[model samples]
Target: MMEQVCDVFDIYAICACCKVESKNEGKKNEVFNNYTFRGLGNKGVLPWKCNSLDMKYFCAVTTYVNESKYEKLKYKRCKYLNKETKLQNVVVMGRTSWESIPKKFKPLSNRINVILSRTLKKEDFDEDVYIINKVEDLIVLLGKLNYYKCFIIGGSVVYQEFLEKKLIKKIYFTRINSTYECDVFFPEINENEYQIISVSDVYTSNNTTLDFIIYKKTNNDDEEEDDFVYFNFNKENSIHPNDFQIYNSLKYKYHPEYQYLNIIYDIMMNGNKQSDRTGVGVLSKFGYIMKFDLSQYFPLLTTKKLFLRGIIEELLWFIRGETNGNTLLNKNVRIWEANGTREFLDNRKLFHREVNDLGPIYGFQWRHFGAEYTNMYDNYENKGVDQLKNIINLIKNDPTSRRILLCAWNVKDLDQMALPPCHILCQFYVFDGKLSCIMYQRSCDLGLGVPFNIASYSIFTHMIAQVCNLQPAQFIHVLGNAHVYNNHIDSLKIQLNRIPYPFPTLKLNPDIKNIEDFTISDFTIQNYVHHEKISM
Candidate 1:
């Protein structure tokens, strides 16, 4: 028979000033430690102990303002504590304070692990235990500490050390409304990370307002980077580099014979100038295009693996012109939660009645288009599911229709939208019996947003190609602001070094031939490869 086990944990919120004050007085330190240990004991959670039965308590501390002064005081305090207490363990971790503590204090510094982050490397620390250098190393340490329930008791730096690591299971915080003059600060958590699990307000004798907030990680599976898939390529049998050059030259206003060599090289070497405004104006600037026979090539980004399911669902939601996050939620997608839905949901403003029935938003504007002069109801009622179908038919049947277009951009209704359209507008083109499409995104966060854009538009192209009785051709992506965030640089560089993989083929379920009938289960990618696993 197998045995089942359950574990319990206790959490606490301690102000730094209070902690330091408690340490100053011997009696106070004993009282504080007793309370903490008792709380843990009652909850059946105990601090980890080594073979010698020597148990230690750890707290991560940092200097907010002047490092030199803070270091001197920290050294003196640690020295005094070592001489004074045999029962307590004090370990402080961070950049400024780690180096300043005296040599004697170093022996007691087993728990003081400095974060040797990519953003800010800690070069001065000589000891391995004092420095955490890589993502893999952090994951290993957290996995080993199954013995003790971790508490992210902190100064801002210490808090940040664990924030991106995604190890924090819970958070306890007090809102200090009164302004305090301080140099160091914590970055506001991205709305996607955590959500308020509970709240309580306490009144002190002095009538000062203090509110306790408890937050828990919102998406438990988000921290595991293994869920993401990466793309791989075989350099052999790849398209000739000069072909991309010819296409690039033809798209531009330059002389026809201008040999650009490679599209990637052309854009990189001759950086986008202001004269390259059409690409910017339309939002289709970054990425390349490959033309192939339907049997030979399936269009997907050769450089990076994409979240195809996410892209499909997101595009479907947008085509519906839905402003509510709930529709995407039904599909297990989270692209719109970061906008206004989260706050609305937190404050109890959103429900089925408001979301499904009465939310005045994007879909209405696209389909009915209000009582204004543009009234799109005629278009909707005249052709329900056939709207997309008819458009495809026209591209195949009447290949030269100047009116072959799909519009989601509505300038007048921007305020009512949950998120202003990113892939704001798109146009279809047909030349020499081949159909191509171009999408214009007003703004794009390159790291998080670009991969999805590539997958979404390419898949849309594939789907449209099927309906139009034509093979997928070129996909031109336009962008307004294309930038990699400061934090994502390393991951981006790692991805760039990866050899380009062969484009994967997308096979839609044979039974589902129309756009309206497509569901999350209807499509799949065949043949995908990459060198390294995905990381966030």
Candidate 2:
């Protein structure tokens, strides 16, 4: 009787800010498109003359609100607010592109204009102009605010970033029949992933001809379905759900590392093949849950060597609410180097951020969420909510409180972050002199990130338990998207084949009860037996 088709979003939804969910179908699957966008910007100046028809089409498409989508958004507004509101399509662009707009057409009237920049402040712009620093933050920004459709209208850097991230669902390109002298070029699109859906009639003006072409992402669902091995109860070759449950239950009871290894194994065997932001296509699964008993043993992987020193230092950096990448770099840890590079920040339109100054990432969000982030060096005292302090206080005073949560996913500050938090939030639970923690991660790299996260959060629980006069019990990890990069397939297969050794015991200095007082020297992992590390 329960076997029936249903819309998953209709049943349950998640909001960026509050707990209240919405069934607004318009917000369910956002319509985001990218335009090849411009043909002639010769050194920040337009080389070609105006295309009146083309300009009209651009404005109409961007400004036209889908009634169904508009109605849904209106319904949400009416249900939640007292004032009348109209949601329009969003136009995302870099500061250069924003400045390129003529003064007369400044706000790009009738549509919502979101300008991406690190140097541009909200104070400098009018109320209608939305300022976001990162291309990825558009989704988070749209979560709270209602919008009809989204268009990526941009400069070279913004265009390239959106393409690289694969956030563009459709592409509208204007191919000029006649070539012109140009310094800026459009980013190349992979033909394998997109198909030319439509081409419009040619338009000629001022001895120049151009054709409008529309390209849509190819449907890879059939290939994905064939690639993944779903659990079919009747299939002779498939592993049934009941069998998987029993096997994991027995394996987990023996050694906790089996849980980690089995996940890798399942992903390698059944994960759906797809492209990723890193361009290292992944074999991914949606959601996974794991538990480790801290009282029994630390959940550090015995299958490979982990960088315990770097993990400790990084966690300490977060606890100290330090956003400067150099803080960890000074300790000879280069984990944040990729993200902390000047080139990377520049690509994100964060030209104002200093080199090695990681923006409001995990550390800043954990300690000072909602605070104005000027720079990594600014004093954030008495600013924003101290989630870590609040978490500790609740655990110490109200043991059974459901409010014991330290969240790193601050939507308001996501744009300023060097990178969004993978480990989103950690909730503490206490009962019978035992303290347990459950952490939810939005993204999990099974090979590298999973191991480090397990150890880092496990040690965090131990430290908090010591401070609160309780014994550390369980560390439960919940994953939103657990994936193994294509390059890691072989290495994970090797890891899965190896027999797990007994997990090592973690020793923490009990005298250092204050969470902030715990240093790298206070942590020691004894008898960490493991196989040789496999490079991805």
Candidate 3:
């Protein structure tokens, strides 16, 4: 029998962006912190008087502003805003916009209304509204609420405030159709800086036409900038042990790990039921992507205990360019044991297989792609181009090639293998002496396999980056089909109930420059603490 130790609400977010911190500022006696003040590289203790560099607000506006600006269609914007409140979207709007709303919906039903005004007082005329005079105070207050994130519904001034502070470079802006009669207008879009991430087809509502559009900010400057790297030292109930952990909490609105869980949360809530090869069925969602910065925290699942012993051993097996499951079996890894069973191998009539011989899977394709397969035992000395060797050389010699790639999905060898690769292809990118990898998987068994897959590729990049004399920057994972097994649901729910601990550190013996020279004893995971494992 299993018992619950924690509930969903008690999981202290610590994940939202702009989480304030101070050594003397206790949670009971919260204090406002500094952002940008007193010249460059020197912003500490001296409180942020006007505004700090650490100021950012999420902007969410509805239709009639960007495309068509259709007049009679403004009523369609009501449904949009209603959905916003329905979903409990934290709304930030200027006084002019608030006053403009009809008397019936004065306080915006379900959402937390944050009213920005220079004239309004907290108790003046309130039906539960958080009022702040300046945007600076609003920033601090949001942090106090343990929420560093907010969405801007808009009136011209609020929209301008988001852009006036230099726009933060990267933004996800959406435009929807509304009815305002050409009386209101917002900023213009510059194609040189923004890219369209996704756009929805214009649809009809109340016999009116409307559309929603999403614009993603693209990299334009010769230099890249990210505020995720906050500069300050707050050493109290303020933050955890490490700077990365503190920063992760400070920027939870878009932090990598939080967003990873957010994706699953969305799928579990809305995905369709589908049957699969395992007979367990799944709640399936397609075309999902998650990114983790290798420079920050490792993308390990903190929600549950993920024993990486097998993931590590199996990865080493891949790096050695060996497809034999016996290699992993010798190291106590059983990931490939099921597929390498004698019953399966014997049916294929494969000889010279005394151990767990898994034919040429990941390793053979990597080190000797397109090579002749002569069972797992035969160490084919010379066969095909080594993709791993070539990628490493490209990174070391010419670190700017966009063609750095490796693949394990050999069309001709799929049927001969025990199980086809879940993560089929991957590509590497290098910029300014840093290496990043993007992997695409055809299928992801989220509970059992995705966790290991994340560690496997991340560690792979870390090792490759170290050997190639480049820092490991990012790990981009693109999934074609992401699904959770029905059988793992109960176990997953149990694991999700357990809150996350501070992430662990990966320590490697710096002496090993070559990938193949790595052994089990050469690597160490320091401070890896987690909850008890679920049965799955």
Candidate 4:
């Protein structure tokens, strides 16, 4: 039988950003042992001064509910579904944490307050609060009370206990960048088990800089376990060792999308840190390879949602060899708006150029390499060597030749471009009525940039294969500096936790044999299932 209410619990705590200042400094005493008391407090209070901004952040995060019927009604989407929809979220805290709150906000209005105390009786607290002794008790208490998400707002020991019990599904950390004197500290999180899924933009208040971050547990079993268990008094609950389940059904374990995920895991585990031009430092690695067999599946990442319109419009813009950023903007694709701004162009000393002119970028370099420098208004009819056209012709005639490559890293044109290309070159190979491509990218931002590039290049290969009367085969990607930015760590880690769904199949209009003749209507991606966008 299906359960009525299944809840996943999250752990929320504010901690020091650096390891050196994470723990509080104090000698062990009988009251506060080293094992039980980590550095959350000194003299039974927070070491750092209280932050009003953090207070607001906490209240808002705990109160807002996207799934609630109240929220849906606010948007005029639907009516209230049930009486349970009116219940507020649940906040579970240790006695000390409960005591730490000001008396004026004792109940933490708009949420159900739950306190954990082994000695406290049910009669000791007011009707507004519920006292529980253990994690299991919290579950049992929750069975009787209908609530939204549960939050473990912590004291050091409470945080440690829940984490040790492997009950937390998510963690919210307001990571203060500086260190302070402390005796108590938050428990060490398993980096492999919990991945940072969201990090807010850095904020500064009262001379303190911190980032509001969230780490999501990478296991898929917690929700399933909650689904199976009930808090009824009839059953005895015992701890079971986490064991692996065997798969007996036929399975294709080698999904091509694993290549993308495997690289993310490897870089997070072993990549070295380096500062870059953007001032957002990157944890980068050199020389990673990924291959996708295009015959059976398209390589669009199913782990996170991607907008196909923007990618298609951008690709179509490139195929036309256009340098005007406004062309993409005209089609509602604003991917180049930042770089094409007049301020940005002025910074590069291209003041004479008109607004939204991106200089000789990818599209311009592809069709008009070696062409004389000119503004976006000029028509380069037969001016430069058309690398794209040359590649298509080579594929049609010289099928055995390996020199059929397209290069966009023009040294002379680099000074004139808005932003130099990360994906600089691609070599096309034709073998046994199949067309394959190997692309070399000089640099890639794994979070935002790589996903777009992978889809764009694979689609490019498919389009070329269709026009040349050949079958699409493989797309091999080679990267030089594949890195995840420090700021993007939280969001990208969310992608790391997702299991990639099967690659979807692509269908193209058979009548559109010419590359230039293909439009958005000519391409279709079928059976695509993806998770919600983390950054969105």
Candidate 5:
């Protein structure tokens, strides 16, 4: 029986990191109430809901077998099916399972396919698909055949056999969004023996939404188990093609992309729908926190492609103490382009604003934050204050100061801008020669804005670390009102389902010593991989 039904990505992280499995629960139809979430034009609908954060029971969770609900398509479960055909080891399944595959795919070429059947003899085995008379003997053949890993690609019978023998080390559950009618059922697992490690967001294929979930057996001994292994493959470590023979840790690591995915997932299942500032309904939550290790390969969203160029430019513009939207045009960053238009300001008139000026926003507060409210376009060389320069100096001069912080929620200047800051306060810490930043946000648009905040701050952490001549430690996001617009539910589901590649390395030129010295070209993201973007 299943023990826990997590709120998407975080549940997986908890299970992977702490070996916590949610207990099974009774079946209850889930629903989402229509509500307006701010910053969104409107909202979208979803299929499920969360009634209790603490789940106690579960029954017949995946008992109804209906593989027929899925359309015949390329292998969707395997993460590396198409990238290459060959494998270091083999794929195991039952005879009927092998036959269930299309004729053209009879013997999956890349890895040796082993078919389990009592009637088959060992002598007649072929290169592509091998025949084994007994399930127990499959192990003996693997070593004799010089194969290290085994992928279970099969029928229910094969899966059942493996479960009965407790041979399944992990389960990749693809929860199909488009429910289908079928005759096969995936075997049930014991909650005590297995743990849900991590999950991909709900993705789409041939008219269905498929969720990728991973479950591993509980361990008793010394070392800790995380979806993200400590050692990652990058230029720092020369792990080559020959290393493919083993379980590539990146394939199963503590993926930081899930931080955003888990938030959206919670909103979908648990957020209360209510009216917002924009008239768009939101499934909103009061408080939430997500933390990422900057040392773990610069937490970037491998699930979707983000506009880093714009992110860097926007951050740099803020540091330069400028609030003019026209400055962003110099770097193709349109983040502040919308509200600057005359039509936008005129519609909400009583304008104390000029065209292309984002009066006293993020940058103004970061650099010259608190002296007085004044024209954004006017130079503030010595007007307000230089908080950024001070914070950097404090990190270097007074590493132990708990007060190393930056606040953008200037109550005195609230009336001078088109919009107040969403992510308002940032506190920096220097412990053991590494810089860590903890942020607080009053409001956020999870689908569209959260990722930007994550990257911007993480990059900020890296930049501060470099300026202070320290290492980047961590980035923490604390939220007050986290909501997802109802209109974006399906699109979010698509984002949830997409697979995330390992994070890429963030390269900041060593020559740039000042906090303001970093440029677009000076920052390079190597080996960045992402799925096709989902438009919000």
Candidate 6:
């Protein structure tokens, strides 16, 4: 069972600095020390050693000299101190009005002293209390801490500072039952930046009411720019084209016993016969699963990095059985633009009628082939989604379904398709309750398509594991004619020279129960520490 890591609370306090300086300063310390002693009793501290003792004795002197006003100060001091005692180990970040500090807390001045000094020493007092000066430094800190749960407590400025910096992981707010006039206020938090995690009402014997709201940050600062272009290619560019960097990277890094270098050389020199020029066949047969259980060792090509969002969206579109570019266009996804353009559509005029005038089809042939006429519509309605579900269920209940298959190639619809499917077919196998998949791509554009194809298929296999109730076993990619595009040779070589980094772990939303119900929001990729985007 997964263990819960942290608890967060949003608290409101009345700041009353004036009261601490006036009547309550001396006598209030006794009340404050008593509260501290009681709170820390179990922590093995002696009563005399309580941090509040000095404040209590000092407050006593002020109260003795001003008896009448001191009485009121004592009452306020106790109220404030009591609240602080209740919340131990609380990290308060932000500025609060001195008046907001309760009367009771007025006596426990040491708490304020320590925090103020630390903030000043770090030059973070006026700035956001948590501001680290450098984004990379913050990343390194989080990587080192590996905190499962973190909270950001704030006054308006503090909250805004963290928001602007994009450092906050979560926020907790309390909607007080009443509102009052204030000199300062928190900025209105944007709903788009967060997702509601929980809401609860606080109750006390006096019928005091307030709502507690918990939220997690969802907005990411690294947005994809439009200067890049994506291409989807066919068999002409798929033959044993050299990806020097991928080959060199694997050769130098892989274990000697793995013999990855020899395997790569053999495939590069001798063309694959199974899929003609496509070297996907050679890879699937020879490639070994590179294991880095603790670190992500999957050296994603950084020299000419591909856009993650574009790749994911395009793959998802394909899985959803979409053929047109409209859906992708609406989402600002353009991975298929190179092949789905007006020029490509015009060239595909001959096969237009056969595909019901749908320009350069992708999904139609992949999922429903007209020639296979095995009553294509009926087959899709009966065997597509339902069959996929049943296959998953079988992997769970039976663990022996050899019928788990996904097809993307349709011989009859080939002419109508803008480009022939790179990943033609995939089959899932179950062994000892673990599930693995093998994908056969008839052709691959190494620079753009191969890395994405590998990662996307790997992710798909993991998604399948959730539906099928099995662990992700392995991914075997079989290419028919995998080759480097002419323009990407230099970029590929640079990537090979660069050190391979660990692959980050992807966490799926535990709340999602079924595959069909899963949305893009339900998944989060974490710990992705990469050098830089690979530029071609």
lDDT of 6 at 61: 22
Candidate 1 or 5, higher TM-score?
5
Q: Cα miss at 240, model 4 (Å)?
A: 24
Sort by lDDT, best first. 4, 2, 5, 3, 1, 6
What is the C-alpha lDDT profile of model 4 across 407-487, one tens digit per residue?
989999887888788888999999999999999999988888888898999999999999999998889999999998887
For each candidate, the alpha-carbon lDDT, in order, equals 0.44, 0.71, 0.60, 0.72, 0.63, 0.44
lDDT of 1 at 515: 58
Residue 104 lDDT (model 3): 89
Consecutive 10-residue window with the lowest summed lDDT within model 1: 33-42
The residue-by-residue lDDT of candidate 3 on 1-536, one tens digit each, is: 33111110111100011112225446333321111000111121112222221112122221112223222222333233232211233467788767765678768654567888988877657577788887666545543342212456655556557555443233333221122223334455455555434323322232222223344444546333433234323432121233233222222233245555655655566667998887788888998888877764566765666767778777788888898887777777878888888887776565455457787789889999988887777767778879999998988888788888898999898877777888888899998888899999999877777888888898888889888878888899998889877776667655543434334556677888998888878777643434556677
Tens-digit per-residue lDDT, 1-536, candidate 1: 32111011112222211111113456322321101111111111111111111111122211112333334433433343343211111222344434434676653332424343444554664555534656345434433332222344444565665566565555554432122224344445554676545433221111122233455566537755543432223332122444343233222221101111133333333334332322432111354432322333344443444556766886666456444566676777766555544455334444332332223344544444442322222234432232354466778788888877665566765544544566766678887757788877766555567666766777787777776666667776666554444444445445433333223466776675555667778788754332334463
TM-score (C-alpha, index-matched) for candidate 3: 0.54
What C-alpha lDDT, on a 0 to 100 scale, does residue 30 get in candidate 5?
Answer: 21
> Each prediction's TM-score against the native?
0.41, 0.54, 0.54, 0.54, 0.57, 0.45
Stretches of candidate 4 exceeding 4 Å from the true structure: 1-253
- How high a TM-score does candidate 5 get? 0.57
Root-mean-square deviation per candidate = 24.3, 28.4, 19.5, 20.9, 18.9, 22.0
Candidate 3 residue spans exceeding 4 A from truth? 1-255, 346-355
> Which candidate number would show the highest TM-score if scored against the true structure?
5
- lDDT (Cα, tens digit) per residue for candidate 2, span 1-536: 22111110011100000011124587423221222223445667544546554566677767777767566654554444344646677788788878876788989988888888989899866656888888657765765566766777767677677766566767665544333445465665676766555544334434443445565655565767644556454577122444333233331223467678778778876888889888889888998899987875677886677769998999899999999999889899999998989899988788899998889998888888888899889999879888888888888899999889898888887867777889999999999999999999999999888999999999999999998899999999998999988777767766665544445678888789798998898998864556666787
**What's model 5's lDDT at 119?**
76
Clashes of each: 14, 0, 13, 11, 35, 34
Once fitted onto the true fold, the runs of candidate 1 whose alpha carbons sit more than 4 angstroms away are 1-296, 302-305, 319-321, 342-366, 370-390
Query: What's the lDDT for residue 197 in model 2?
Result: 54
